[PDB]
């Protein structure tokens, strides 16, 4: 099997700049003088779309801002300039041998201005409490870069146990990211503590955004 290895795994390019994704094969991919390397584009909740075929040929309706190159083992995808709609997963694929193999994908994103997150905290609902559970929800909305450190403090103590964080893919109109952190306990344990704190350290500041509530 021809293994295709792309690099980097994730990018972040400012609007107007050039993005270049590398894809190398374990075995040659051009039979004769034609390179069987294809590139696809896949936006979230979307089927892949053919971008380049035979190494450097534009797919249908593909802007001249996307170009492909390389031969044999090493291939590259170029995007210049970067535009607000290009954020997507790009995969390379060889179609010389069977099976047809794809690369791991490279997630290219728009590097926008930094953006601090908007943290909101919500205590368990009466309805959930009534059912014996106590989920505390914390929304860290619209920040950039996605690199963030989300932690919980129960009465001042670090609680690693019981939380599920979830990020949203780069926003389409914003280029920001979002996240929900949820701490789940039992009604009983929830009632054993007073203070519940949701904290976020992000490069936009040295002090974390601490959001809290006393039950």
């Amino acid at each position: 099997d021809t293994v295709l290895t792309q690099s980097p795994a994730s990018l972040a390019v400012s609007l107007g700049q050039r993005a270049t994704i590398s894809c190398r094969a374990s075995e040659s991919v051009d039979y004769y003088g034609k390179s069987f390397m294809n590139w696809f584009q896949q936006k979230p909740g979307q089927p892949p779309k053919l971008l380049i075929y035979a190494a450097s040929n534009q797919g249908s309706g593909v802007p001249a801002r996307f170009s492909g190159s390389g031969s044999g083992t090493d291939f590259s995808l170029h995007i210049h300039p970067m535009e607000e709609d290009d954020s997507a997963m790009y995969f390379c694929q060889q179609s010389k041998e069977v099976p047809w193999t794809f690369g791991g994908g490279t997630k290219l994103e728009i590097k926008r201005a930094d953006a601090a997150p908007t943290v909101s905290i919500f205590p368990p609902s009466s309805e959930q409490l009534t059912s014996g559970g106590a989920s505390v929800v914390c929304f860290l909305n619209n920040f950039y870069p996605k690199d963030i450190n989300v932690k919980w403090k129960i009465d001042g103590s670090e609680r690693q146990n019981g939380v599920l964080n979830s990020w949203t893919d780069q926003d389409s109109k914003d280029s920001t990211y979002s996240m929900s952190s949820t701490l789940t306990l039992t009604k009983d344990e929830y009632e054993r503590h007073n203070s519940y704190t949701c904290e976020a350290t992000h490069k936009t500041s040295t002090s974390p955004i601490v959001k809290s509530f006393n039950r």
């Binding site: 034609k34 075929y53 995969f91 099976p99 791991g104 989920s135 909305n141």
Partner: protein
């Protein structure tokens, strides 16, 4: 216009069977070889099977060899994928792609030039469960509200705000699996004036349990 539409997906028990179809439109189907490609977080894109226009030739990826069977109904413009002896490893989004040939003067080059939206196939023994929707009420000119929909199976769940009236400033987060049960949360931001003077409600539908619930976010107190 080339058009491919998959269907048949769903939740299947480990060891079970299911047949996905793929309805084509916009091109002379009987002249194009077809493919089935699948994607999972742990897979990325992975080729599944290939069948020529006349089916005289078929290819299977090793992992699928002996269990799946690609076939086609040229007259009905349908392509199929019969899966049996399913494993969790088969859980993925199945796309059918059209093997189109670019008339290169160097010899026609074949490339999967059109794909479909795909169908979800989850293979699991975890039991179908309707979710619990809980109101996320506030503790600035804008206020963030939300809904927590937890304990459901399988995906997906549909979340809308005020029947879809509220569409701007809504974040519906990816569901997380924690012991065969999913949990997801959505947030809506509205001018502080609007709340609570004007109602905000999250409309949550879980097709698999045929459950649909609307939860009005009322002040705590």
């Amino acid at each position: 216009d080339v058009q491919l539409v998959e269907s048949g997906g769903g939740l299947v028990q480990p060891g079970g069977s299911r047949k996905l179809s793929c309805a084509a439109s916009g091109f002379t189907f009987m002249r194009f070889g077809m493919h089935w490609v699948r994607q999972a977080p742990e897979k990325g894109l992975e080729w599944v099977a290939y069948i020529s226009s006349g089916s005289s030739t078929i290819y299977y990826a090793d992992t699928v060899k002996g269990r799946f069977t690609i076939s086609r109904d040229n007259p009905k413009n349908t392509l199929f994928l019969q899966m049996t002896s399913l494993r969790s490893e088969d859980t993925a989004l199945y796309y059918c792609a059209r093997s189109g040939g670019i008339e290169r003067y160097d010899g026609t080059y074949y490339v999967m030039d059109y794909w479909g939206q795909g169908t979800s196939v989850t293979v699991s023994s975890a039991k179908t469960t309707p979710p619990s929707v809980y109101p996320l009420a506030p503790g600035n000119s804008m206020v963030t509200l939300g809904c927590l929909v937890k304990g459901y199976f399988p995906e997906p769940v549909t979340v809308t705000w005020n029947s879809g009236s509220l569409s701007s400033g809504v974040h519906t987060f990816p569901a997380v699996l924690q012991s065969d049960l999913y949990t997801l949360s959505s947030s809506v931001t509205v001018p502080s004036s609007p709340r609570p003077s004007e109602t905000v409600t999250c409309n949550v539908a879980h097709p698999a349990s045929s459950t649909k619930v609307d939860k009005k976010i009322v002040p705590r107190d």
